[PDB]
Amino acid sequence: YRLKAYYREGEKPSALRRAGKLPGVMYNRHLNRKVYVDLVEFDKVFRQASIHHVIVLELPDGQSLPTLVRQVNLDKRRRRPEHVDFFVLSDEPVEMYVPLRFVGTPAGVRAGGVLQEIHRDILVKVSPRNIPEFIEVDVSGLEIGDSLHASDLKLPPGVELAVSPEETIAAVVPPEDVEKLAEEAAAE
């Protein structure tokens, strides 16, 4: 994706938002530059892009930088993005959160279970060239009460699980209405 990023300097970060620009900074292992983008633009761009793909930032300098939001500071008091980071890549293997597509028909659904998920995006080390839109999650033969772990992952080549090879990925917990309530009020 793209985004017309501008250079900052002595602008009021607070009064800046009032205008309509989203404060933030782009930087890598050798970079550190005050910048800012447009609220409306970044809004619709980040909706799709999010923090899994790479968003090139077109500075007035004409520099097309392979950046991805390393971090977002969300304003409390009615959610809304305040600040944004933009970590630029190069040719060195970089870590990041990669999407996970839970595809299949869990045995829980059949027995009237609950679609549980934990890591909708795992942190993994990978080269800048590899941009796997997502990883096929074989969640299907998973019955109610069973769990798929990080050590049970199918990793696309050139990638490693930069986590703790035993980290929960998903589950299948039970429903809850009648039985629980009626029995809880009397057994609590």
Footprint of RNA (CB under 7 A): 8, 12-15, 23-25, 27-29, 32, 34, 40, 44, 70-71, 73, 77, 82-83, 85, 87, 95, 110-113, 116, 118, 144-147, 149, 164, 166-168, 171, 173-175
**Strand ranges of the sheet holding 94-102, from the earlier edge strand across to the other edge:** 135-137, 94-102, 121-126, 159-160
Bridging pattern class, strands 21-27 and 80-88: parallel
- When binding is defined by CB under 8 A, the residue of 5, 96, 137, 153 that contacts another protein is 96
- When binding is defined by CB under 8 A, the residue of 3, 5, 35, 81 that contacts another protein is 81
Type of residue numbered 28:
N
CA angle 9, 11, 12 (to 5 degrees): 140
CB of 81 to another protein, least distance (A): 7
Q: After which residues is the chain broken (C to N over 2.5 A)?
A: none
Three-state secondary structure call for residue 161: coil
- When binding is defined by CB under 8 A, the residue of 69, 88, 137, 153 that contacts another protein is 69
Should residue 68 be labelled a site residue for another protein when binding is judged by CB under 8 A?
Answer: yes
Q: In this structure, what DSSP letter does residue 185 have? A: H
List residues binding another protein (CB under 8 A): 46-47, 50-52, 68-72, 74, 76-79, 81, 87, 94-97, 112, 114-117, 121, 123, 173, 175-178, 180-181
